[PDB]
Amino acid sequence: LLPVKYCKMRIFSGSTAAAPEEEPFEVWLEQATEIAKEWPIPEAEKKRWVAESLRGPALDLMHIVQADNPSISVGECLEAFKQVFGSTESRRTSQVKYLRTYQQEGEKISAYVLRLETLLRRAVEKRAIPRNIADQVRLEQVMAGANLGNVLWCRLQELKDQGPLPTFLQLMKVIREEEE
Amino acid sequence: LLPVKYCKMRIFSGSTAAAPEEEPFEVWLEQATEIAKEWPIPEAEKKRWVAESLRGPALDLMHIVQADNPSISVGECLEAFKQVFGSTESRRTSQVKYLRTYQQEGEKISAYVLRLETLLRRAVEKRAIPRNIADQVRLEQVMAGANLGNVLWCRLQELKDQGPLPTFLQLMKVIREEEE
Amino acid sequence: LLPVKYCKMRIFSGSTAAAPEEEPFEVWLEQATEIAKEWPIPEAEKKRWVAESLRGPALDLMHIVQADNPSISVGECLEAFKQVFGSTESRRTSQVKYLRTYQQEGEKISAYVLRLETLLRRAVEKRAIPRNIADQVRLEQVMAGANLGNVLWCRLQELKDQGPLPTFLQLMKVIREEEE
Amino acid sequence: LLPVKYCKMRIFSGSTAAAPEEEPFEVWLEQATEIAKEWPIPEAEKKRWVAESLRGPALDLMHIVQADNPSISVGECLEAFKQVFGSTESRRTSQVKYLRTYQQEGEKISAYVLRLETLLRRAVEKRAIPRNIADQVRLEQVMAGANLGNVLWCRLQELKDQGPLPTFLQLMKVIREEEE
Amino acid sequence: LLPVKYCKMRIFSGSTAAAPEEEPFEVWLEQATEIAKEWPIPEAEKKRWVAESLRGPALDLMHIVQADNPSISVGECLEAFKQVFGSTESRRTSQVKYLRTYQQEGEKISAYVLRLETLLRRAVEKRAIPRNIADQVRLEQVMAGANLGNVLWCRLQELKDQGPLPTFLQLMKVIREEEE
Numbered sequence: 001l002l003p004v005k006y007c008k009m010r011i012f013s014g015s016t017a018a019a020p021e022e023e024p025f026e027v028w029l030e031q032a033t034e035i036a037k038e039w040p041i042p043e044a045e046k047k048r049w050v051a052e053s054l055r056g057p058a059l060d061l062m063h064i065v066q067a068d069n070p071s072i073s074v075g076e077c078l079e080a081f082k083q084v085f086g087s088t089e090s091r092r093t094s095q096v097k098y099l100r101t102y103q104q105e106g107e108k109i110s111a112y113v114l115r116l117e118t119l120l121r122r123a124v125e126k127r128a129i130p131r132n133i134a135d136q137v138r139l140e141q142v143m144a145g146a147n148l149g150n151v152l153w154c155r156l157q158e159l160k161d162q163g164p165l166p167t168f169l170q171l172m173k174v175i176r177e178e179e180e
Numbered sequence: 181l182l183p184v185k186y187c188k189m190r191i192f193s194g195s196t197a198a199a200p201e202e203e204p205f206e207v208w209l210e211q212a213t214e215i216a217k218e219w220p221i222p223e224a225e226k227k228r229w230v231a232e233s234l235r236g237p238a239l240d241l242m243h244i245v246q247a248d249n250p251s252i253s254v255g256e257c258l259e260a261f262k263q264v265f266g267s268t269e270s271r272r273t274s275q276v277k278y279l280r281t282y283q284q285e286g287e288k289i290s291a292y293v294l295r296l297e298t299l300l301r302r303a304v305e306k307r308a309i310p311r312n313i314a315d316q317v318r319l320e321q322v323m324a325g326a327n328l329g330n331v332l333w334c335r336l337q338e339l340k341d342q343g344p345l346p347t348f349l350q351l352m353k354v355i356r357e358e359e360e
Numbered sequence: 361l362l363p364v365k366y367c368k369m370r371i372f373s374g375s376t377a378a379a380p381e382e383e384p385f386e387v388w389l390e391q392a393t394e395i396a397k398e399w400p401i402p403e404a405e406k407k408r409w410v411a412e413s414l415r416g417p418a419l420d421l422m423h424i425v426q427a428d429n430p431s432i433s434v435g436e437c438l439e440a441f442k443q444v445f446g447s448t449e450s451r452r453t454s455q456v457k458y459l460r461t462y463q464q465e466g467e468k469i470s471a472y473v474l475r476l477e478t479l480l481r482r483a484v485e486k487r488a489i490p491r492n493i494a495d496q497v498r499l500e501q502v503m504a505g506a507n508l509g510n511v512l513w514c515r516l517q518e519l520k521d522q523g524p525l526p527t528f529l530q531l532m533k534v535i536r537e538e539e540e
Numbered sequence: 541l542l543p544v545k546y547c548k549m550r551i552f553s554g555s556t557a558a559a560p561e562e563e564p565f566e567v568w569l570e571q572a573t574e575i576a577k578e579w580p581i582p583e584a585e586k587k588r589w590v591a592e593s594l595r596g597p598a599l600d601l602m603h604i605v606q607a608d609n610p611s612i613s614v615g616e617c618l619e620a621f622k623q624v625f626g627s628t629e630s631r632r633t634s635q636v637k638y639l640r641t642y643q644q645e646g647e648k649i650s651a652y653v654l655r656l657e658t659l660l661r662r663a664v665e666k667r668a669i670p671r672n673i674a675d676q677v678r679l680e681q682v683m684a685g686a687n688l689g690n691v692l693w694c695r696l697q698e699l700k701d702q703g704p705l706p707t708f709l710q711l712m713k714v715i716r717e718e719e720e
Numbered sequence: 721l722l723p724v725k726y727c728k729m730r731i732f733s734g735s736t737a738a739a740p741e742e743e744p745f746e747v748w749l750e751q752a753t754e755i756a757k758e759w760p761i762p763e764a765e766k767k768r769w770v771a772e773s774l775r776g777p778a779l780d781l782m783h784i785v786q787a788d789n790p791s792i793s794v795g796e797c798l799e800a801f802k803q804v805f806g807s808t809e810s811r812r813t814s815q816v817k818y819l820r821t822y823q824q825e826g827e828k829i830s831a832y833v834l835r836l837e838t839l840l841r842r843a844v845e846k847r848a849i850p851r852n853i854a855d856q857v858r859l860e861q862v863m864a865g866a867n868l869g870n871v872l873w874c875r876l877q878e879l880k881d882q883g884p885l886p887t888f889l890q891l892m893k894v895i896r897e898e899e900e
Contacts, residue, residue, distance in 0.1 A: 002761065003545045003729065003769060005183040007592045009363060014294075016286060019200060020559065027599065041362065049363065052187055057291070059207065060298045064348065067301060084294070084352055088360040105556065110624045118600045121607070168608040169620070176623050182581060183549060183589055186724070187363045194471070199380070220721075228541060229723060232367045237471070239387065240478045244528060247481070263532055264470050268540045365723045369543055376831065379740060409543070412727050417831070419747065420838045424888065427841055444834065444892055448900045543725035547772050560739065567779065646736050650804060651777070654734075658780045661787065708784060712804055720810055 014058035014085060025085045028053065029078065036074040046074045058085070091128045098123050102145050109146050110175050116141060117168055135165035142171070152178040194238035194265055205265045208233065209258065216254040226254045238265070271308040278303050278317075282325035289326050290355045296321060297348050315345035322351075332358040374418035374445050385445045388413065389438065396434040406434050418445065451488040458483050458497075462505045469506050470535050476501060477528055495525040502531070512538040554598035554625050565625040568593065569618065576614040586614045598625070631668040638663045638677075642685035649692065650715050653682055657708050675705040682711075692718060734778035734805055745805045748773065749798065756794040766794045778805070811848040818843045818857075822865035829866050830895045836861060837888050855885035862891070872898040 011021060012028035035049050051062050058081075065080045066072065089097075098119045103112045120138055123129045129137055139160055143153065155174060159166060166174060191201060192208035215229050231242050238261070245252060245260045269277070278299045283292040300318065303309045309317060319340050322328070328336060335354065339346060346354065371381065372388035395409050411422050418441070425432065425440045449457075458479045463472040480498055483489045489497055499520055503513060515534055519526055526534070551561060552568035575590050591602045598621070605612060605620050629637075638659045643652040660678060663669045669677055683696050695718055699706075706714065731741055732748035755769050771782050778801070785800045786792065809817070818839045823832040840858065843849045849857060859880050862868075868876070875894060879886055886894070 001544055002759065002765075003547050003772075004726070005547050005549060006366070006726075007183050007185045007549055007589070009185065009187045011188065014291075016288075016291070023595075027595075039362075052363075055190075055203065055207075057294055061294065064297055064301060068348075080349060083349055084290075084356075086356075088356060090360050093360075108624075108628065114597065114601050114604070114624055117604050118597075121604060168604055169612075172620060172623060179623075179628065182579060183592070185361065185363045185592070186366045189365050189367060194474075196467075196471075219723075225541065229367075235383075235387075237474060237478075241474055244474075244477055244481065248527060248529065260529060260532070263529075263536055264474060268468075268536075270540060362721065364721065366546075366726045367723065369725060369727045371728075374834075376826075376828075412543075415730075415743065415747075417834060421834065424837055424841060428887075440889055443889055444830075444896075448896050450900065453900070541725060543727045545729060546726045547729045547769075563775075651734075651736070654777060654781060654784075654804060657784055661784065707788065709788070709800055709803070712800075716803060716808055719808060720813055 009053050011053055011055060012058050013056040015056050029081065032078055036078055043074055050074060050077065089126065091126060094123045094126050094128050099141065103147060108179065110172065110179055112146055113142055113171065113175065116145065135167065138171065139166065149178065189233050191233055191235055192238050193236040195236050209261065212258055216258055223254060230254060230257065269306060271306060274303045274306045274308045279321065283327060288359060289328065290352060290359050292326055293322055293351060293355060318351060319345060329358065369413055371413055371415060372418050373416040375416045389441065392438055396438060403434060410434060410437065449482065449486060451486055454483045454486050454488040459501065463507055469539050470532060472506060473502055473531060473535060476505065498531065499526065510538055549593050551593055551595055552598050553596040555596050569621065572618055576618055583614055590614060590617065629666060631666055634663040634666050634668045639681065643687050648719065649686055650712060650719060652686055653711065653715060656681060675707065678711065679706065729773050731773055731775050732778050733776040735776050749801065749806065752798055756798055763794055770794060770797065809846065811846055814843045814846045814848040819861065823867055828899060830892060830899050832866055833862050833892060833895055858888065858891060859885060
């Protein structure tokens with residue numbers, strides 16, 4: 001036979017002693033929600049294919065939750081996982097971490113705005129930023145936090161004046177022209 | 181022709197000092213009973229699929245058991261594995277191990293109460309605790325074994341006197357709201 | 361699409377710096393003898409599937425042994441592997457290692473008689489014990505080897521005196537009852 | 541039970557603290573562009589298999605880009621990846637890196653000219669070296685940067701004086717005839 | 721719905737600092753020549769399955785070789801790999817490297833004679849040693865290069881005087897019996 005390419009199931013544990021093959025919880029929750037919502041197979045199998053992706057403390061929770069209610073849906077199992085493992089960030093601490101992110105790692109301007117944007121996305125899920133200015137606070141924090149050249153600095157400020165508040169892909173296209 | 185998303189076998193070994201990817205026995209027995217009862221495959225291949233999850237002392241038991249009776253069923257193999265490796269606990273010993281279990285130096289309180297809830301389920305399956313007092317022995321064992329940061333100590337002492345005591349998911353909802 | 365469990369080939373090497381993913385030779389020899397004896401495929405292709413389980417020094421032995429004789433059987437290759445890598449136990453080191461093996465460090469008595477039984481199979485295949493008394497030397501070595509009290513000793517001695525010499529499974533059943 | 545030969549998905553992550561399994565981005569982009577262009581599967585499942593090769597910061601860029609515009613093509617995702625992680629060399633910096641690259645302590649002459657040729661290809665793709673003299677700057681940089689042992693310096697000076705100019709494989713044939 | 725066995729593709733890299741999974745080149749070339757000769761698919765598929773076995777410097781050679789001539793066959797690619805990485809040794813150098821090879825400072829005598837026998841096969845393929853004296857040079861080179869002592873020295877010199885000299889497997893049996 002011709003060779004097989006394959007992807008591992010992403011495994012989650014909740015353990016503080018996390019292995020290199022174990023993901024952070026949000027990555028696993030995307031896989032688990034795909035199994036719950038998008039796979040064609042019955043919920044009596046979807047319970048099992050979620051459990052196969054768990055080991056250690058997080059697998060114990062799958063047992064605890066089914067012991068409390070054998071009739072539970074997979075979606076409601078994931079609500080229990082969200083309840084337990086969903087992050088402890090406050091509005092204050094998400095805002096501080098978003099504002100005190102500052103190109104320290106020698107990043108390109110494009111790489112810095114990628115890292116920053118992960119925290120901005122988080123802050124917008126917490127509603128810690130108004131969605132109607134999420135683009136403005138991106139420009140603000142990039143212009144505060146990045147070692148800009150003037151030719152890009154004035155181009156961002158022109159877009160800020162004109163009203164085309166960049167989406168992340170628009171801000172990237174604008175950064176592409178000056179960074180290349 | 182395309183990548184197949186495929187899943188890790190749950191390895192077991194029976195050694196005290198097990199490797200980081202090797203499961204506790206109860207989790208392995210759940211996999212092995214699925215191979216025994218549920219898979220469509222012929223029984224000569226069921227033995228193969230059981231044995232290819234074993235390593236070290238547990239694989240040696242499979243060899244011993246097969247050598248004394250080549251005609252043995254996979255069900256009677258798993259009865260031998262239960263009879264060797266299965267948990268030995270009783271009413272008094274399970275209550276003691278539960279009540280003796282305190283918060284370890286590296287544990288966050290939310291992780292400790294999750295670990296502790298597994299021990300409570302163990303004790304309830306041994307009929308060592310009546311389910312109708314499980315909430316009491318949660319709050320009390322948490323308060324006896326963990327440090328509670330003074331502010332959560334007051335909140336759990338309030339809840340202990342409140343009347344309607346927390347279920348585990350609600351207790352975690354509270355404990356996460358103090359982990360922030 | 362739907363995931364299923366993959367089973368990794370058990371690679372062997374004979375290297376002194378053995379990797380965690382490399383089995384001890386006896387485990388590999390079971391896999392290789394299965395490929396030799398049980399697989400339906402032609403012997404030229406059996407040589408290939410045996411070779412794909414080897415790397416480093418043990419793969420070089422496959423090349424050396426084929427270079428001496430291209431017509432060689434897989435069985436004769438495995439005789440060369442047994443010669444080179446199989447353990448050098450004598451009828452006096454097997455007996456001493458067996459008889460010197462006590463229960464240790466607070467092992468479960470069941471886990472001890474399992475550990476002990478692996479050495480008794482080693483000694484019986486060396487014919488370093490008469491097969492017709494293997495159960496006798498097992499009972500005696502357990503009674504000498506396991507630190508004990510209570511009726512367990514009395515029950516084993518009763519079975520020894522009565523004449524119903526236990527199989528390993530019957531011995532294990534009795535040991536669990538007094539271990540719990 | 542017959543084994544299939546398998547090939548692992550080359551994972552990428554974009555962290556500067558990269559793990560030993562993770563490729564440089566240029567190799568990952570060759571896999572990702574195969575998925576985008578060649579595989580017969582619909583774009584939703586193409587996006588899934590591209591994303592399933594990612595871990596950490598690179599996966600965060602995929603999530604950001606899909607959230608910022610769900611209508612985006614796979615090719616447009618890869619354009620975002622090219623911008624963020626693709627190396628921004630210049631005619632100045634590439635010429636410097638090429639000419640600066642001398643033979644390390646451990647490199648044999650063939651291993652050195654192989655490493656060196658990768659940097660020459662890099663520089664030629666930026667038009668930093670005219671293709672019609674690429675071979676000239678190869679032989680010259682070999683002589684400038686190699687610690688050619690005694691008679692190798694004499695032989696390479698005769699080869700710089702050859703007349704017609706070697707392609708890389710012809711230069712390798714010559715170097716390998718000397719190498720002992 | 722079927723669980724499956726997996727064999728790892730033998731990755732090669734050509735770095736002198738080779739990682740623990742990575743083969744010596746001659747073993748990789750045996751895999752790549754299987755892909756070139758024996759697999760039924762077109763040359764475009766063959767090129768891909770060869771490239772997906774390569775990592776680091778050796779993958780860069782595959783890019784260089786294809787970029788010079790996209791019309792190249794996989795057979796001609798493997799000739800370029802043989803030329804760059806495949807060993808070139810003369811009769812003088814193969815004789816010297818066999819004779820200069822002593823027991824390594826932490827090595828066992830049994831591992832040494834197996835390591836040494838690989839170098840004898842190498843030297844016989846260069847026609848650097850006549851096959852009809854290979855046994856003589858095995859005993860002499862073991863005795864010259866190993867930290868021998870005790871009745872092993874006596875038994876080996878006895879075997880040198882015996883008339884018909886050991887085969888490799890018989891010499892290993894003797895050295896293993898003294899290893900105990």
